[PDB]
Amino acid sequence: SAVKAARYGKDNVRVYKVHKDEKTGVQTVYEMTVCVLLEGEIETSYTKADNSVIVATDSIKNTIYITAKQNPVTPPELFGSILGTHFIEKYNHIHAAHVNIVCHRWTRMDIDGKPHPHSFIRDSEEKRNVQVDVVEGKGIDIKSSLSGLTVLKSTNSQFWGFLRDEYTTLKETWDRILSTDVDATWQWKNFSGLQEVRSHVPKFDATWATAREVTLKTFAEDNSASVQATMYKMAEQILARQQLIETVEYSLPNKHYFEIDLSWHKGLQNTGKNAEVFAPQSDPNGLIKCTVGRS
Amino acid sequence: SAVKAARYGKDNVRVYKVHKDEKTGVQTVYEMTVCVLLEGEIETSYTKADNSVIVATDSIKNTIYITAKQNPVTPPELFGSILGTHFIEKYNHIHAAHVNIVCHRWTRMDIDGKPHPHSFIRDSEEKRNVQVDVVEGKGIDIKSSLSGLTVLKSTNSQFWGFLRDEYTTLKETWDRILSTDVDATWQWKNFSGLQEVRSHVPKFDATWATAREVTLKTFAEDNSASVQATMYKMAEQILARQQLIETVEYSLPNKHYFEIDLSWHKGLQNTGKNAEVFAPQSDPNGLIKCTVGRS
Amino acid sequence: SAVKAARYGKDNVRVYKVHKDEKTGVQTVYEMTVCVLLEGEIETSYTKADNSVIVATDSIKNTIYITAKQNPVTPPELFGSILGTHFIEKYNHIHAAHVNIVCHRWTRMDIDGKPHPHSFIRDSEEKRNVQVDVVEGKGIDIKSSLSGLTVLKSTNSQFWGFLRDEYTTLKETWDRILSTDVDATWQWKNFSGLQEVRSHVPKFDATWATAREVTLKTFAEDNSASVQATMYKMAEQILARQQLIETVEYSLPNKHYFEIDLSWHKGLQNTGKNAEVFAPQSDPNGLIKCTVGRS
Amino acid sequence: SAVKAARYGKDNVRVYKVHKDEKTGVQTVYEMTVCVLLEGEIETSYTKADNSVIVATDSIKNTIYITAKQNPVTPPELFGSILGTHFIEKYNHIHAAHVNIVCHRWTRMDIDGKPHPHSFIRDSEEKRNVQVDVVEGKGIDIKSSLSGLTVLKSTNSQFWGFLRDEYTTLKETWDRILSTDVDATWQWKNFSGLQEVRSHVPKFDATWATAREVTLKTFAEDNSASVQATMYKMAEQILARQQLIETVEYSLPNKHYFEIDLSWHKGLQNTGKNAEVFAPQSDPNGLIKCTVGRS
Ligand SMILES: O=c1[nH]c(=O)c2[nH]c(=O)[nH]c2[nH]1
Ligand SMILES: O=c1[nH]c(=O)c2[nH]c(=O)[nH]c2[nH]1
Ligand SMILES: O=c1[nH]c(=O)c2[nH]c(=O)[nH]c2[nH]1
Ligand SMILES: O=c1[nH]c(=O)c2[nH]c(=O)[nH]c2[nH]1
Ligand code: NA
Ligand code: NA
Ligand code: NA
Ligand code: NA
């Protein structure tokens, strides 16, 4: 037998960092969950019980904390690039580092219409994520995403005109509920190394903001023909607004809300134009994906 | 043997309702999870396989939907009272109904600074809950709560002056992080029946708003001596502002954030006044509770 | 305002203990999750920011580990009694201790038909739990339970003869699937203190075994008239077999499996006697409870 | 813009099937969760709001149930191949089908040492999974796996001889606890179509059994030098025993159990050879992966 691929590291490393402006007294917090997996000339650890080539995963953990202490942790695209570059530059035999970061929300509280200097609220489970692959001699590949953005619109969603055969029972409709959990990923052009990532630092936060804004506005305003059509509209607008992204990927469940026929009870009308009470379905769910690039 | 207590019903009933203003075109959605358990003269179902006394839990499910169709579902204190009263009035042998409702957030989206007429976002997993007990000949007992409100403050939390013995290793501190998940419950005076609940309907939403506001403001502004002291301050202010509540109950975990000593690495200073990077701890956690009433 | 009730402590304390027989070399492991909440003369911590009366929850955590080091951790009824008694005897002003323990399964592996001396498997998420309340001057109250025991029977479950009115759509049936998650609690007679708990130590493991055996055998062999009737049969047999228990409590969901009508497709027969493929329903679910004591 | 990739379908489709031997009366149940995603000439659904090319995901759901009614659902490698082949043969414009199946455990109960004819227990959350990719003109690719197999050994695990630099604090050890959640995947040689999958049907269950047996025996008996070395041993034995598998992939977390130093309390000895009580750590965790193929 032979080792065809191998990677190892530390997962689920929770990190908090605070910044304190001592001249205004305003504090700012950051909280993330980090995973770092390494690749390189490490097969003998597997095949020959040779631990001399292992950078202990405990040491990987320490390195994450030390790196956070000595460098900015925002935007996460930059922090992940710094972290990954460290491993490939420090260890001769380590040739690739894979960094995943999940950013948790801590939004400043407003007290009596004023932003509070050191108090925060978690306003949703939506996450801002990055995947950074640092590969010796091949630069830095970054994928940015938002996930866990849950939305619903109560009307201005349609689904008709689909294929009908002997497996089909679904009725066509011109007015339904649409709800989803948004997972959206934008893939950056390859960067040659950390200097080039630094040169583009302002683009990371602005592109995340744009992706979020485009997603919400398109969802709210599109008289949707299907999930497929709406998500394509989102992707094409993001691409038009940031030339340094190569592709946009959406993964959207269709979280179904079923009409409930009550006419068996005293002739109650609760379907079609009379539909007021619905049954949210936990499973199954549609799952729709697409990757959009430039022609 | 003998049956000492018994209750049965339907759990995890998901319900959506929409309201449509046809003159402005604005839509408003409500989504909840409902549980209904019944008590009464039903022991023979257990002891004698006598199903004639069982209101099927499937029928309980249908009744929830029909009741939502025919009545307002806000505020949840009212809906739960209506639902519970139905069972005890409709079935001679059913003497108590226990209704629990969890309200999920669907907050209207703002698009380009305007509130959107039919699009919504889940801005956090915080819930608004009610527990309504309807007991024949003893009125309606209501407990209202908010839960899942997650907050953090980065400073202006202290913990010193506690008991020190041979089991104690914890250092005193005058500056720490405080983070918690707020669980807060206010218990209403008993109501004689549904007429009296109706008479107080505006008090339910305003009291929820007050409890939320008092919790956030007290958390943000209190230079906290302990979790115990801060939560008492919250409870006493709520009681002072709504005479119809009898008690306020808080249940707060202390979600610990540990300092990380890095001095072993190149003499790095990351403790005390130099603390910038911390390790959020998933477990264990402190758990602090209290029930406050009027003297 | 006034403090009407208060308790505080440490939750989610994970503990492992190993026992090593150095003469046979066999090792035995135990793993649990522990919560300890205290009550007593502690109101001034809440009302007056007086921390002098607080036994720090960090110290409670240390005490759990020290107690596990110095005493047996099985059966959990004994360990919890020891732990709770410690707090009320050591601290004059602490008058009640509430201990909850969740026991996780580590079952010895059999390798080539031989029990392995130091290797274990988690064979299910079923838990063995205890709730121990130690109250100064009122002894020791213990509730033992098993939870997370998930079972299914494919036939020999019925449900007919229930109440039918204008809210009822459910069809009667003489052959259905029955599946549940068993939650079963037996409440011991009050014990006067730790000496009396020690005197009964062998009864704790045997009574847990009996409760488990009775539950599985009754579920498997009863031609069930309803969940209500089957659970009563379980409870009465447990009571008959351990005189020192006062009550038995069951809480059972009915996890529904729905028939799927396929006759719209090529006349396929998949209902009633022809039912082969079913749709497991995640929600809603029936919930059935009862407490049985002795006449 | 242009669509670079697209797939869509139904997720989280829960399915139960029963088999009844009417001559012995023994029943056998199967329960799974199924996902089916399709690819093909469907871009116009995204770009042009052309729903005529969409096989509705609701119809995909119906097809899963109908297919389960008309065909064996074991072994899952066969069922998934049948299901995927259906879509590419039935729809001219659908060229790839991706089927994922999760098999849930329902193990027959033994009552009084006899296997019960229709009663089952869920003995762990371990799953048996398959991923089947059916691609028009390129056959059938199958990946089989077991996941959620949680084990612990209390000794005969070591970790020393690793790289030590200024990021390293971890002590070497010759005796530690090792615990993991096993995720193991074996990739079958490509099959030309459904006829060839049928010809190998007995190999699927036997290879799953072998992979499970090899994993448990190797874990139990290996005096482990590291997670890396132990997992390689497992992979190489599986490859040696089934010539039709091309690669074996393991993904193993190292779920850490920390020693607790108690010497600060009355000189208690609980480290090294005296270690009896340990602290299970929920996070972070090591993560170790490798893919093994044949030289
Ligand atoms: O937007 C949708 N797309 C689909 O492909 C689909 N299929 C289905 O059943 N409902 C929907 N809705
Ligand atoms: O606010 C707190 N209260 C306590 O009772 C306690 N105990 C502890 O260890 N930390 C804290 N903090
Ligand atoms: O065993 C059952 N008990 C009930 O009370 C009930 N109600 C229902 O709809 N199904 C069942 N089944
Ligand atoms: O088996 C192990 N492998 C590692 O790579 C590692 N790293 C670490 O800190 N502990 C371990 N243990
Ligand atoms: Na390198
Ligand atoms: Na009544
Ligand atoms: Na005492
Ligand atoms: Na095809």
Side-chain angles (χ1 to χ4, degrees):
Chain A
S1 316
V3 178
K4 177 159 170 260
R7 62 175 70 177
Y8 85 105
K10 202 72 139 192
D11 199 0
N12 294 303
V13 182
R14 296 186 70 190
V15 186
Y16 163 102
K17 190 173 183 186
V18 58
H19 164 274
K20 307 181 154 160
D21 179 312
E22 223 72 83
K23 270 182 311 308
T24 75
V26 175
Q27 305 188 354
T28 304
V29 298
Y30 308 95
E31 184 174 337
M32 63 202 159
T33 308
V34 180
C35 174
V36 177
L37 308 179
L38 307 183
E39 301 183 72
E41 304 173 41
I42 61 174
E43 54 268 11
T44 53
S45 61
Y46 296 85
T47 54
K48 295 303 187 179
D50 193 358
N51 288 338
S52 77
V53 303
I54 303 174
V55 179
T57 67
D58 191 76
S59 314
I60 299 171
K61 175 191 75 166
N62 296 333
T63 301
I64 297 163
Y65 303 147
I66 293 162
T67 304
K69 173 71 176 170
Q70 290 177 315
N71 298 276
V73 292
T74 52
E77 287 91 349
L78 172 64
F79 183 64
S81 296
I82 296 174
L83 193 54
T85 298
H86 165 82
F87 287 100
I88 59 154
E89 291 191 342
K90 178 76 187 150
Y91 301 101
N92 272 341
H93 69 300
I94 293 311
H95 303 304
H98 308 280
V99 184
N100 288 298
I101 303 170
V102 172
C103 300
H104 308 286
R105 295 178 68 94
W106 283 125
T107 296
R108 196 178 294 290
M109 280 187 210
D110 287 300
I111 308 318
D112 288 319
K114 293 195 137 58
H116 201 264
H118 55 253
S119 300
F120 304 91
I121 188 155
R122 163 107 5 112
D123 72 324
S124 104
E125 278 310 302
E126 175 194 341
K127 309 305 180 199
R128 175 173 168 179
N129 321 290
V130 305
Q131 172 182 332
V132 174
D133 300 294
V134 179
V135 179
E136 186 158 8
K138 310 269 180 22
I140 302 181
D141 289 305
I142 306 183
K143 300 174 78 125
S144 303
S145 59
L146 51 86
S147 63
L149 173 57
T150 296
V151 293
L152 186 148
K153 62 187 311 191
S154 52
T155 192
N156 270 26
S157 173
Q158 310 186 19
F159 192 61
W160 53 267
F162 46 92
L163 190 143
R164 305 199 70 95
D165 69 4
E166 70 271 18
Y167 292 89
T168 312
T169 58
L170 181 72
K171 297 172 58 242
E172 304 181 307
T173 180
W174 292 258
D175 199 356
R176 63 178 191 175
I177 292 153
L178 181 55
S179 181
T180 190
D181 303 324
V182 179
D183 191 331
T185 302
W186 41 107
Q187 165 95 238
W188 295 89
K189 173 192 76 75
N190 180 253
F191 301 113
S192 63
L194 194 55
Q195 180 185 349
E196 201 192 349
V197 172
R198 287 184 195 282
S199 64
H200 295 299
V201 145
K203 293 194 172 66
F204 298 122
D205 284 349
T207 298
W208 169 86
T210 290
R212 196 171 188 274
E213 289 167 7
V214 162
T215 293
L216 293 172
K217 187 175 170 181
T218 304
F219 181 81
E221 288 192 343
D222 194 40
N223 201 332
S224 171
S226 66
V227 176
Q228 289 85 340
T230 295
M231 72 204 280
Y232 183 83
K233 287 190 198 197
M234 295 168 177
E236 81 169 336
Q237 292 172 59
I238 293 167
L239 287 171
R241 270 142 104 153
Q242 183 40 258
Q243 281 311 279
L244 286 163
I245 57 191
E246 295 197 350
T247 61
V248 176
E249 189 170 23
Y250 275 86
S251 177
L252 300 184
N254 190 358
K255 304 166 82 181
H256 306 301
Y257 289 62
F258 282 0
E259 281 192 2
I260 303 167
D261 184 346
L262 294 181
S263 67
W264 58 269
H265 181 86
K266 294 190 176 141
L268 278 171
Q269 293 317 294
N270 193 50
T271 65
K273 316 178 155 157
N274 293 130
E276 295 170 280
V277 176
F278 297 68
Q281 303 294 298
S282 297
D283 53 77
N285 58 280
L287 185 53
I288 316 307
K289 313 188 176 267
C290 168
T291 302
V292 185
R294 283 207 200 71
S295 49
Chain B
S1 316
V3 178
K4 177 159 170 260
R7 62 175 70 177
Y8 85 105
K10 202 72 139 192
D11 199 0
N12 294 303
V13 182
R14 296 186 70 190
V15 186
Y16 163 102
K17 190 173 183 186
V18 58
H19 164 274
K20 307 181 154 160
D21 179 312
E22 223 72 83
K23 270 182 311 308
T24 75
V26 175
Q27 305 188 354
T28 304
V29 298
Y30 308 95
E31 184 174 337
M32 63 202 159
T33 308
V34 180
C35 174
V36 177
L37 308 179
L38 307 183
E39 301 183 72
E41 304 173 41
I42 61 174
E43 54 268 11
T44 53
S45 61
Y46 296 85
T47 54
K48 295 303 187 179
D50 193 358
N51 288 338
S52 77
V53 303
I54 303 174
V55 179
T57 67
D58 191 76
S59 314
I60 299 171
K61 175 191 75 166
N62 296 333
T63 301
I64 297 163
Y65 303 147
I66 293 162
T67 304
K69 173 71 176 170
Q70 290 177 315
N71 298 276
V73 292
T74 52
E77 287 91 349
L78 172 64
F79 183 64
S81 296
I82 296 174
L83 193 54
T85 298
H86 165 82
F87 287 100
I88 59 154
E89 291 191 342
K90 178 76 187 150
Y91 301 101
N92 272 341
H93 69 300
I94 293 311
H95 303 304
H98 308 280
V99 184
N100 288 298
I101 303 170
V102 172
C103 300
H104 308 286
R105 295 178 68 94
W106 283 125
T107 296
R108 196 178 294 290
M109 280 187 210
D110 287 300
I111 308 318
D112 288 319
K114 293 195 137 58
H116 201 264
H118 55 253
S119 300
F120 304 91
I121 188 155
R122 163 107 5 112
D123 72 324
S124 104
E125 278 310 302
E126 175 194 341
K127 309 305 180 199
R128 175 173 168 179
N129 321 290
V130 305
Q131 172 182 332
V132 174
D133 300 294
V134 179
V135 179
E136 186 158 8
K138 310 269 180 22
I140 302 181
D141 289 305
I142 306 183
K143 300 174 78 125
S144 303
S145 59
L146 51 86
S147 63
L149 173 57
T150 296
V151 293
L152 186 148
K153 62 187 311 191
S154 52
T155 192
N156 270 26
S157 173
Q158 310 186 19
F159 192 61
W160 53 267
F162 46 92
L163 190 143
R164 305 199 70 95
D165 69 4
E166 70 271 18
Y167 292 89
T168 312
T169 58
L170 181 72
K171 297 172 58 242
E172 304 181 307
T173 180
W174 292 258
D175 199 356
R176 63 178 191 175
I177 292 153
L178 181 55
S179 181
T180 190
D181 303 324
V182 179
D183 191 331
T185 302
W186 41 107
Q187 165 95 238
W188 295 89
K189 173 192 76 75
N190 180 253
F191 301 113
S192 63
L194 194 55
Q195 180 185 349
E196 201 192 349
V197 172
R198 287 184 195 282
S199 64
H200 295 299
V201 145
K203 293 194 172 66
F204 298 122
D205 284 349
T207 298
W208 169 86
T210 290
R212 196 171 188 274
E213 289 167 7
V214 162
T215 293
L216 293 172
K217 187 175 170 181
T218 304
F219 181 81
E221 288 192 343
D222 194 40
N223 201 332
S224 171
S226 66
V227 176
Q228 289 85 340
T230 295
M231 72 204 280
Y232 183 83
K233 287 190 198 197
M234 295 168 177
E236 81 169 336
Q237 292 172 59
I238 293 167
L239 287 171
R241 270 142 104 153
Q242 183 40 258
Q243 281 311 279
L244 286 163
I245 57 191
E246 295 197 350
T247 61
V248 176
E249 189 170 23
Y250 275 86
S251 177
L252 300 184
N254 190 358
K255 304 166 82 181
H256 306 301
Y257 289 62
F258 282 0
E259 281 192 2
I260 303 167
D261 184 346
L262 294 181
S263 67
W264 58 269
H265 181 86
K266 294 190 176 141
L268 278 171
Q269 293 317 294
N270 193 50
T271 65
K273 316 178 155 157
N274 293 130
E276 295 170 280
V277 176
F278 297 68
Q281 303 294 298
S282 297
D283 53 77
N285 58 280
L287 185 53
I288 316 307
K289 313 188 176 267
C290 168
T291 302
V292 185
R294 283 207 200 71
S295 49
Chain C
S1 316
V3 178
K4 177 159 170 260
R7 62 175 70 177
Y8 85 105
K10 202 72 139 192
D11 199 0
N12 294 303
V13 182
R14 296 186 70 190
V15 186
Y16 163 102
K17 190 173 183 186
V18 58
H19 164 274
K20 307 181 154 160
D21 179 312
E22 223 72 83
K23 270 182 311 308
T24 75
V26 175
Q27 305 188 354
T28 304
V29 298
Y30 308 95
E31 184 174 337
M32 63 202 159
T33 308
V34 180
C35 174
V36 177
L37 308 179
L38 307 183
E39 301 183 72
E41 304 173 41
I42 61 174
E43 54 268 11
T44 53
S45 61
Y46 296 85
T47 54
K48 295 303 187 179
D50 193 358
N51 288 338
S52 77
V53 303
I54 303 174
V55 179
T57 67
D58 191 76
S59 314
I60 299 171
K61 175 191 75 166
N62 296 333
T63 301
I64 297 163
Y65 303 147
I66 293 162
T67 304
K69 173 71 176 170
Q70 290 177 315
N71 298 276
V73 292
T74 52
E77 287 91 349
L78 172 64
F79 183 64
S81 296
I82 296 174
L83 193 54
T85 298
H86 165 82
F87 287 100
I88 59 154
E89 291 191 342
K90 178 76 187 150
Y91 301 101
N92 272 341
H93 69 300
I94 293 311
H95 303 304
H98 308 280
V99 184
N100 288 298
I101 303 170
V102 172
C103 300
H104 308 286
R105 295 178 68 94
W106 283 125
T107 296
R108 196 178 294 290
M109 280 187 210
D110 287 300
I111 308 318
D112 288 319
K114 293 195 137 58
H116 201 264
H118 55 253
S119 300
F120 304 91
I121 188 155
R122 163 107 5 112
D123 72 324
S124 104
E125 278 310 302
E126 175 194 341
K127 309 305 180 199
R128 175 173 168 179
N129 321 290
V130 305
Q131 172 182 332
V132 174
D133 300 294
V134 179
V135 179
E136 186 158 8
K138 310 269 180 22
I140 302 181
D141 289 305
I142 306 183
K143 300 174 78 125
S144 303
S145 59
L146 51 86
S147 63
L149 173 57
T150 296
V151 293
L152 186 148
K153 62 187 311 191
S154 52
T155 192
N156 270 26
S157 173
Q158 310 186 19
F159 192 61
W160 53 267
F162 46 92
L163 190 143
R164 305 199 70 95
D165 69 4
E166 70 271 18
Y167 292 89
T168 312
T169 58
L170 181 72
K171 297 172 58 242
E172 304 181 307
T173 180
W174 292 258
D175 199 356
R176 63 178 191 175
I177 292 153
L178 181 55
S179 181
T180 190
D181 303 324
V182 179
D183 191 331
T185 302
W186 41 107
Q187 165 95 238
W188 295 89
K189 173 192 76 75
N190 180 253
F191 301 113
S192 63
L194 194 55
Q195 180 185 349
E196 201 192 349
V197 172
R198 287 184 195 282
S199 64
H200 295 299
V201 145
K203 293 194 172 66
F204 298 122
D205 284 349
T207 298
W208 169 86
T210 290
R212 196 171 188 274
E213 289 167 7
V214 162
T215 293
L216 293 172
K217 187 175 170 181
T218 304
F219 181 81
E221 288 192 343
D222 194 40
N223 201 332
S224 171
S226 66
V227 176
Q228 289 85 340
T230 295
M231 72 204 280
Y232 183 83
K233 287 190 198 197
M234 295 168 177
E236 81 169 336
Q237 292 172 59
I238 293 167
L239 287 171
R241 270 142 104 153
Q242 183 40 258
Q243 281 311 279
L244 286 163
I245 57 191
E246 295 197 350
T247 61
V248 176
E249 189 170 23
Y250 275 86
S251 177
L252 300 184
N254 190 358
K255 304 166 82 181
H256 306 301
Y257 289 62
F258 282 0
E259 281 192 2
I260 303 167
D261 184 346
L262 294 181
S263 67
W264 58 269
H265 181 86
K266 294 190 176 141
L268 278 171
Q269 293 317 294
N270 193 50
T271 65
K273 316 178 155 157
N274 293 130
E276 295 170 280
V277 176
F278 297 68
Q281 303 294 298
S282 297
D283 53 77
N285 58 280
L287 185 53
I288 316 307
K289 313 188 176 267
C290 168
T291 302
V292 185
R294 283 207 200 71
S295 49
Chain D
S1 316
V3 178
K4 177 159 170 260
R7 62 175 70 177
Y8 85 105
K10 202 72 139 192
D11 199 0
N12 294 303
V13 182
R14 296 186 70 190
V15 186
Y16 163 102
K17 190 173 183 186
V18 58
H19 164 274
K20 307 181 154 160
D21 179 312
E22 223 72 83
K23 270 182 311 308
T24 75
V26 175
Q27 305 188 354
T28 304
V29 298
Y30 308 95
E31 184 174 337
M32 63 202 159
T33 308
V34 180
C35 174
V36 177
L37 308 179
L38 307 183
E39 301 183 72
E41 304 173 41
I42 61 174
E43 54 268 11
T44 53
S45 61
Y46 296 85
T47 54
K48 295 303 187 179
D50 193 358
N51 288 338
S52 77
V53 303
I54 303 174
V55 179
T57 67
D58 191 76
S59 314
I60 299 171
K61 175 191 75 166
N62 296 333
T63 301
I64 297 163
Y65 303 147
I66 293 162
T67 304
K69 173 71 176 170
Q70 290 177 315
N71 298 276
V73 292
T74 52
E77 287 91 349
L78 172 64
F79 183 64
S81 296
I82 296 174
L83 193 54
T85 298
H86 165 82
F87 287 100
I88 59 154
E89 291 191 342
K90 178 76 187 150
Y91 301 101
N92 272 341
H93 69 300
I94 293 311
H95 303 304
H98 308 280
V99 184
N100 288 298
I101 303 170
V102 172
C103 300
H104 308 286
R105 295 178 68 94
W106 283 125
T107 296
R108 196 178 294 290
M109 280 187 210
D110 287 300
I111 308 318
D112 288 319
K114 293 195 137 58
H116 201 264
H118 55 253
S119 300
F120 304 91
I121 188 155
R122 163 107 5 112
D123 72 324
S124 104
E125 278 310 302
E126 175 194 341
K127 309 305 180 199
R128 175 173 168 179
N129 321 290
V130 305
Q131 172 182 332
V132 174
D133 300 294
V134 179
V135 179
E136 186 158 8
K138 310 269 180 22
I140 302 181
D141 289 305
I142 306 183
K143 300 174 78 125
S144 303
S145 59
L146 51 86
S147 63
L149 173 57
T150 296
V151 293
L152 186 148
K153 62 187 311 191
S154 52
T155 192
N156 270 26
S157 173
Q158 310 186 19
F159 192 61
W160 53 267
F162 46 92
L163 190 143
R164 305 199 70 95
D165 69 4
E166 70 271 18
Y167 292 89
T168 312
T169 58
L170 181 72
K171 297 172 58 242
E172 304 181 307
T173 180
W174 292 258
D175 199 356
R176 63 178 191 175
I177 292 153
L178 181 55
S179 181
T180 190
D181 303 324
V182 179
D183 191 331
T185 302
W186 41 107
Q187 165 95 238
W188 295 89
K189 173 192 76 75
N190 180 253
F191 301 113
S192 63
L194 194 55
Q195 180 185 349
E196 201 192 349
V197 172
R198 287 184 195 282
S199 64
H200 295 299
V201 145
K203 293 194 172 66
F204 298 122
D205 284 349
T207 298
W208 169 86
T210 290
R212 196 171 188 274
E213 289 167 7
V214 162
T215 293
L216 293 172
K217 187 175 170 181
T218 304
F219 181 81
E221 288 192 343
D222 194 40
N223 201 332
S224 171
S226 66
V227 176
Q228 289 85 340
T230 295
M231 72 204 280
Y232 183 83
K233 287 190 198 197
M234 295 168 177
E236 81 169 336
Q237 292 172 59
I238 293 167
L239 287 171
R241 270 142 104 153
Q242 183 40 258
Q243 281 311 279
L244 286 163
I245 57 191
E246 295 197 350
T247 61
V248 176
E249 189 170 23
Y250 275 86
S251 177
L252 300 184
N254 190 358
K255 304 166 82 181
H256 306 301
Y257 289 62
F258 282 0
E259 281 192 2
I260 303 167
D261 184 346
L262 294 181
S263 67
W264 58 269
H265 181 86
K266 294 190 176 141
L268 278 171
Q269 293 317 294
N270 193 50
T271 65
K273 316 178 155 157
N274 293 130
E276 295 170 280
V277 176
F278 297 68
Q281 303 294 298
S282 297
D283 53 77
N285 58 280
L287 185 53
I288 316 307
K289 313 188 176 267
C290 168
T291 302
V292 185
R294 283 207 200 71
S295 49

